[PDB]
Amino acid sequence: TKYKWTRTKVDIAEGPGTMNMANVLSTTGAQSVALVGERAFYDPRTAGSKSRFDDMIKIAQLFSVMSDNTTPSSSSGIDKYGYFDWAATVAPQNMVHRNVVTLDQFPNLNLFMNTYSYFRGSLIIRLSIYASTFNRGRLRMGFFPNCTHDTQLELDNAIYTICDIGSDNSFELTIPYSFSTWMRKTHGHQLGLFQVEVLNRLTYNSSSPNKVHCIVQGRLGDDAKFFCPTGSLVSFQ
Amino acid sequence: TKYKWTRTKVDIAEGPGTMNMANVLSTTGAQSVALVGERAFYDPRTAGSKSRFDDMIKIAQLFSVMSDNTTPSSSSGIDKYGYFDWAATVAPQNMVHRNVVTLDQFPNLNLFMNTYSYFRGSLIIRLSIYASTFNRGRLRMGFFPNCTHDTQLELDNAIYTICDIGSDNSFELTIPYSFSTWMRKTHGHQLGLFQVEVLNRLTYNSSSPNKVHCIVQGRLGDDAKFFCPTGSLVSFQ
Amino acid sequence: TKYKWTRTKVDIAEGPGTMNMANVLSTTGAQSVALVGERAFYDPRTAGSKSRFDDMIKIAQLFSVMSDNTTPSSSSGIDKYGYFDWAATVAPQNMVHRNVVTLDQFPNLNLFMNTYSYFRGSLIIRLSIYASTFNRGRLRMGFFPNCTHDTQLELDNAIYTICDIGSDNSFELTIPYSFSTWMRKTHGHQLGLFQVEVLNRLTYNSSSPNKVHCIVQGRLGDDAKFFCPTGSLVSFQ
Amino acid sequence: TTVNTTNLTQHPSAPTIPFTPDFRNVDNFHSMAYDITTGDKNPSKLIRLDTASWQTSYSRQYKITTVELPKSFWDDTRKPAYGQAKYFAAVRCGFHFQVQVNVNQGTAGSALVVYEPKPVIDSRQYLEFGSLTNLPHVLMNLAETTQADLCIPYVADTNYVKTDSSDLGQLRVYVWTPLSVPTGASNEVDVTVMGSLLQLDFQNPRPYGE
Amino acid sequence: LSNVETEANNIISGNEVGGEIITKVADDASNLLGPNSFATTAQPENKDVVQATTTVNTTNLTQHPSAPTIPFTPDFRNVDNFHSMAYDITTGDKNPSKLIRLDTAS
Amino acid sequence: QSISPNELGLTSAQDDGPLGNEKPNYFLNFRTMNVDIFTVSHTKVDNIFGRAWYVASHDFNNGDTWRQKLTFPKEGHGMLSQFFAYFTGEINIHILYMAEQGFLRVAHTYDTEDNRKTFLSSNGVITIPAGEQMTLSVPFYSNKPLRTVRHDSALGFLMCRPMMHGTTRTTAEVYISLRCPNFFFPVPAPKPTGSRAA
Amino acid sequence: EQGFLRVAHTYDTEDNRKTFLSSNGVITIPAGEQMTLSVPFYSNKPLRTVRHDSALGFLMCRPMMHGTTRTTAEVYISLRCPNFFFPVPAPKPTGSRAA
């Protein structure tokens, strides 16, 4: 029955040892192997929804308050995060807040940076002020994309975004992606700086709240995306 | 003689260790391997019959009395399974029987649920009453597809099926497949409840049997089918 | 140089261990393997004859006397196998011989049944009587295809075949293949029964041989064939 | 045959109808124009489900008023969630919600309405709030919008759910910005939710009480 | 009887003009017609069949049959073969007739 | 239309009628919806016997060699055994060998019949090296056709010779799976085997 | 053990059994070899899976014979072509971080 026959393959560049991997996997390109068990295949159904999606960054794209104790607060007690826009601070050059910086923010971007490490994209930010309809006021928002150590009215230098409240909230200011290279590290390497600055007062009438405030929540998108995985982690959590 | 040549395959994602399985098998998709021995192949004939069939559920589909000692009885002594429809029970709201529930029934569905575990389909049931031609009577049949703890005339609530005897027997009532999910577990998880209820009497004349009775046998089909195997078992039997 | 590439085969359903068989072989379907040595190939010639043949049953198909000591005899001393048709035996219902039964017969069918075990086909038999031209006589031949324990004139029941001698010998009677199933075992399981029966005498004149006799040789064919091998053996011989 | 109950009878007599019956199906003439309704259509409509509480004792993350799982129409003493579902055991239905919170002008505070869909309410874990903000929610700014609309298609693991026992969605109103109190005005703005039910299915009968 | 059942129906369609739901006219009455129908059908159909089987030289007249009751798809034969001792068939038809011995010596 | 035992016509069954009414569950309108991929054979034959497992058996005392020939009952079988009545099929054997660290070899084949002397390698051979995988398929033949008794059982024999010896213990494993069962199966499904009389 | 022994494994489903495991499946993996299977699904009551059971299941591992020395195993997972969708995203915010 000898052809030949078959003779031969004998590459084998191997070492028939993964071969069957282990190793383990990367990057998939290894489908259901040494099949299988057996056999056919399933036929599921919704609902659910007709939501079969990759992405990922579609699940980012959701405005989420920054942590709890950011300032911190919530409770912690009150504030009642966002500090307080409350009369006394006037002097049109002041207010309070701060970044340092960063990317925690633990509204689930914690978990993203706790699995992937690299990315490119912006951190669209929202400030949302709550007060009744009577009183009104303006205030700005500084953000520097580098960034430095606090660092005063150069917040007048850099980016801006005026704020009127109002009917009705909330607000927005974006950032374009700013850095050298292309990817950035997702750990404690770098990001910018953020203040809110009272310029004119938030006034009050004799029947009024007299105290008005903020909440600030960021999200990443819609240009963004992540590159490569890593084990991290935060133990675990 | 070097081409090349052959060089190479060297996948091997392996680990040339099943490879040849062991493991063992699943799902077949492994035909006669490392062949063989050798060679040709057979050429059988009936009879027999021209009965080459898959299925399976074709071999279920056969009405089979429920066990022996169901009630139990048979003998055990008499009854003579099916209890007895015998005068004294009147009070159109009564009779006797009971499920709890289940799927044993050991007319070979024992062995099905003792190899496969999952399925969908109904349990078509038959009651068959034996009495001579003279006497007559009506009686109903309750079945709840959940089910609960006994649990009275709500048997008037749920499903029904009237019974007249008669010329001649037997009878039938079905159940549609009722449960959440899609598959159900085939072990002692759940099924319904079953009574027979005397409403009017089964009368008798001065020359007559004076005692008349039942037998009840179920079967599964024709919509049914089973999913996946399992080792079970009942030791073994 | 990574394609890909090759990645992969990785079946391997193995276990690269025969693979190259050992095991050993069955059924050939394994030709000259791990070739080879090398290379070309031969170019033979007859003679010989132009006799390249499969079969096998062509080499059976050759009339061959049954053993030596069948009766036994040859010498052993004389007889001079075939017993003797010699006057005294008259009584048209008698003669002598016997099978029990069988398939040994050791004219090389010994070796067939000593390598293969199974088959289907008949045992064409020949009786050959030797006497000079003067004297004459008739005799029959019983054979039962089951068979039993001796077992008289039911030899008149069963198969027949008359015999006249004559000018000139020899003779023949066949058997059709008779059994249940399809294959039969080739060991000591079963076969029939055989007598020769003198009905009229084999006469003699005053110048004549006065003693006349037989030889009997069987062979298998032409419908026959064998199925599967086995190690047997007769040690070895 | 009738719904869920067959009657097999062996010795009939005759239909025996009185004269030319031609029976209906109003009428009309009219008989209280309301048609028809439910169940088909009475079992599904807005309904009240809520109560009163507030002031300043609540820090922002402090819970407010949880509204119960599908059991909460059953144990409600009014509409279907009582009559028909006190018969059948199996329920599959969508959900439609209007939540009403009206304050007195001049004050501001936020309310948050989320619809957790049975995620083993586990312990929610303490930092997970945003978190809690990815869900099919609604954020009421009480300065302006006095009502809020919401629609939940239900999703649950199983393809059906036991009537009062196995549930699915649990409304929770959480406070956001504990309320501001000008001096002076009423201390309590309370809350209300009024619900409505979409095309609705009961199945799988069972005796009365269970 | 026959028309009466369809009268129960035609009542059903009486209230069917109500898509509710759908309807078929509680409770599934949509059939009170029965299965053609409370009559008769088979059982004491008697004569309800009478049978009158036959075999060589013997008739069996039986008055209350039940049913043929065959096991699966019988298709029964008539070797086979496969073969089962090639001898076919024989007699009687053909065994009863053959040469035979009848004689003796003197 | 409500059937009648001891009445017509056969062993068939029916559509069992499209009652209730509807109603909406309630009696019918049951239409099959295949959930799986669909291989669907999970209800069908072939596949299931296609899987394997069975007997985990045949330990081995070292001294000495030879055989003993073992009778494969085919059932057993005893794990997935809940399934059967009938007679036949053309096997697929799986053999495994746990022994000396790559020291030794195992020769195996079958069978047929009664007995022999003998050189076994005639009727076949399959040299399986130490610590390797369990691989064969047999076809059939005499094997007197006529199918096979069905509860012999199971008509047969395996022959196992562990060649040389490495002075330590030795162990083997035998799994079975029969593929493309002609089976039919025949005369189903008599042997009700409702034993359960376990 | 240096190429001594074998490992049989399969799953699962469900609650319990006696039993002969080889019924519900088998995958004889020889000593010192590579980590290879893919399961498909089924009853597996469809309805998807709780999501935080967890994780609805069981693996069954029998190490056959014995070689008188110690023994060790490893289990890695990867789920492919996830239908997932995923469904109801991305509720379970799991912002625990409350690590």
Residue numbers in the entry:
A (entry chain B), B (entry chain B), C (entry chain B): 20 to 256
D (entry chain C): 73 to 282
E (entry chain C): 20 to 125
F (entry chain A): 24 to 221
G (entry chain A): 123 to 221
From the paper:
However, an emerging pathogen, human parechovirus 3 (HPeV3) can cause severe central nervous system infections such as meningitis, and is a leading cause of neonatal sepsis. We utilized cryo-electron microscopy and image reconstruction to analyse the structure of HPeV3 on its own and in complex with a human monoclonal antibody Fab. The HPeV3 capsid is composed of 60 copies of three β-jellyroll proteins, VP0, VP1 and VP3 in a T=1, pseudo T=3 arrangement. The virion structure shows that VP1 pocket-binding drugs, such as pleconaril, are unlikely to bind to HPeV; that VP0 is an important protein for stabilizing the inner surface of the capsid, and finally, that the assembly of HPeV is most likely controlled by multiple interactions of the genome with the capsid, through conserved amino acids in VP1 and VP3 and stem-loop structures in the RNA.
We determined a 4.3 Å resolution HPeV3 structure using electron cryo-microscopy and single particle analysis. Homology models of capsid proteins VP0, VP1 and VP3 were used as starting models to generate an atomic model of HPeV3 constrained by the density from the reconstruction. Unusually for a picornavirus, we showed by polyacrylamide gel electrophoresis protein analysis and from the structure, that VP0 does not undergo autocatalytic cleavage into VP4 (N-terminal) and VP2 (C-terminal) in the virion. Similar to many picornaviruses, HPeV3 possesses an open channel at each fivefold vertex and a canyon for potential receptor and antibody binding, however, it is wide and shallow. Five VP3 N termini come together to form an annulus at the base of the channel, giving intra-pentamer stability. Instead the VP0 N terminus straddles an adjacent threefold on the inner surface of the capsid, forming a loop that stabilises the twofold-related VP0 from another pentamer (pentamers 1 and 3), a conformation that has not been previously observed to our knowledge. Unusually, about 25% of the genomic RNA is highly ordered, and at high occupancy in the reconstruction. Finger-like RNA densities come into close contact with capsid proteins VP1 and VP3 around the vertices that could accommodate about 30 nucleotides. Moreover, we identified the conserved regions in the N terminus of VP3 (T20-R26, T47-T65), hZ helix and the βIC terminus regions of VP1 (R202-N205) as the structured RNA interaction sites. We revealed the unusual stability of these capsids at the intra-pentamer level by VP3 interactions and at the inter-pentamer by VP0, and propose that the uncoating mechanism of the HPeV genome will be significantly different to that of other picornaviruses.
